[PDB]
Design a protein around this ligand. Sequence first.
Ligand code: NA
Ligand SMILES: [Zn+2]
Length: 330
Amino acid sequence: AQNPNCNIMIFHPTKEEFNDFDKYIAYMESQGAHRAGLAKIIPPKEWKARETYDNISEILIATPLQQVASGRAGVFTQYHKKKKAMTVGEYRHLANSKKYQTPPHQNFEDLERKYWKNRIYNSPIYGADISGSLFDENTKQWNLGHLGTIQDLLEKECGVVIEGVNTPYLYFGMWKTTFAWHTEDMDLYSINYLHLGEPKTWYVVPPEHGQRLERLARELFPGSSRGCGAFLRHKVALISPTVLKENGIPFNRITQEAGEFMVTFPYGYHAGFNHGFNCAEAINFATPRWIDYGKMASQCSCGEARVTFSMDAFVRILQPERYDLWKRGQ
Ligand code: NA
Ligand SMILES: [Zn+2]
């Protein structure tokens, strides 16, 4: 079996290999990439997402979110406090201000140390889940707005036509902006392109060991776990690498830089943080291999996990037994 230790693999496709998205995902899996839960793809030197990022300042972040932490440095939850709308230009200025700017640091490891030591004592602001794309329409390879839809995949595999659309989202981040431990909706794949700015550090648990993280999360967040048997779907829980190590949880870490893609694989738990001002674009996608994960995905029915109406059809068709209860939660 390929990649038995579940290491994060990094790929350098040629322009030729970059010409068929689906084929290259399958290729990566043939090499065992999915066992890690996360892979990095460095685009060929010939490729570009768009010409320049000189004209993005007028994008609106309708509802910036302040991420307020509760708990201890290595084991905390965060809630999202809504803030007044601002443009990307205004946001960039705020990110670079003395209050929010990245501290001096020696390297990525040093900054990681500072993050886990100090994150809870600050409340960074970020723009999340902004429908839109920064790929040029003329970018023909790995354009996240031009991928095949999950609805078409489900139709092709299962024969059923369903409503729903599948469009990309933008994220604007700053130092200490935090992504909580989660898998994707319906344990889908995701792909994330870092368009501009400072890095993102990722942590990931191999899919085969997802239940180990869930078990630890139940132990570390007992109140939340009592409230909901899939509370990680709420996307509020953080656990540091130190605590994961102490508890023997298998995981890996990697830093994504501007111009790099990251793919998360079905049931790959991941979390991370931004190093400073940046802009990323992400979208969920599916392959034939996803279907069996979709059928088995745990669901939040307690009301907390709010998702797009596009997920309705996936639960309805793949998980009919769970549908009524889940629907009540929405
Ligand atoms: Na994700
Ligand atoms: Zn819930």
